[PDB]
Design a protein around this ligand. Structure first.
Ligand SMILES: *[C@@H]1O[C@H](CO)[C@@H](O[C@@H]2O[C@H](CO)[C@@H](O)[C@H](O)[C@H]2NC(C)=O)[C@H](O)[C@H]1NC(C)=O
Ligand SMILES: [Cu+2]
Length: 223
């Protein structure tokens, strides 16, 4: 249970729920076929925001994960329970208007992921123990303009069967400045990119102890 509730850019937090479309409830999406898998949604409720956050292409945005919208600390329990082991992931979608695009459908491309490392530590654990900070590089070579950023943590502690994996995501609204447009990513759809049978979605992280992990979705886009 967690929310990507604000975004930091060039050292500046853009504000709670400002430019990030936040639910007030921190529960996961469970059905990868639901429209809610794109930018969260029913049975949650997601607020709108008229802020579109500017970021220079090639630089990083940092999603700031918190337990609840009311959480004001940054200790592990203020981020997400440490049972919730799994990957962190981030995607972009080029859109006409970052405040009105729903995010549902084709156009997403993956720009970051962190599954399990060679020490057995998961991407969510680095966020939990790193003040909720999930740092994500905006590629230099993409087209400038309006985008959605979908940042995600997947908790796998109850994922032995499907349903079971817990998908926590929110969409931020970006104005990417300075992208060269030299490369146009191949894209996937949400819903569509994940399936309940994926090896990183239906997975026992206990039996046997997990030593490698396949993050769901497409390969990371690179310039
Ligand atoms: C910008 O975001 C990228 C991820 O998109 C970060 O790169 C990762 O950094 C971690 C921590 O050092 C490494 O373990 C990974 O190997 C890096 N991944 C890649 C693909 O390079 C990067 O550190 C972030 N930069 C800043 C300044 O926050
Ligand atoms: Cu939870």
């Amino acid at each position: 249970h967690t929310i990507f509730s604000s975004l930091e850019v060039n050292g500046v937090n853009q504000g709670l729920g400002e430019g990030v479309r936040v639910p007030t409830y921190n529960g996961p999406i469970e059905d990868v076929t639901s429209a809610s898998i794109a930018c969260n949604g029913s049975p949650n409720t997601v607020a709108s925001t008229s802020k579109v956050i500017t970021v220079q292409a090639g630089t990083n945005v940092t999603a700031i994960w918190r337990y609840m919208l009311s959480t004001t600390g940054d200790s592990p329990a203020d981020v997400m329970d440490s049972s919730h082991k799994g990957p962190t992931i981030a995607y972009l979608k080029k859109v006409d208007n970052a405040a009105t695009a729903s995010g549902v459908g084709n156009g997403w491309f993956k720009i970051q992921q962190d599954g399990m490392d060679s020490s057995g530590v998961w991407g969510t654990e680095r966020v939990i123990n790193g003040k909720g900070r999930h740092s994500i590089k905006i590629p230099e070579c993409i087209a400038p303009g309006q985008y959605l950023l979908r940042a995600e943590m997947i908790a796998l502690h109850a994922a032995s069967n499907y349903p079971g994996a817990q998908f926590y995501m929110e969409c931020a609204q970006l104005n990417v400045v300075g992208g060269t447009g030299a490369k146009t990513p191949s894209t996937v759809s949400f819903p569509g990119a994940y399936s309940g049978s994926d090896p990183g979605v239906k997975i026992s992280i206990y039996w046997p102890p997990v030593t490698s992990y396949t993050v769901p979705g497409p390969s990371v886009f690179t310039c």
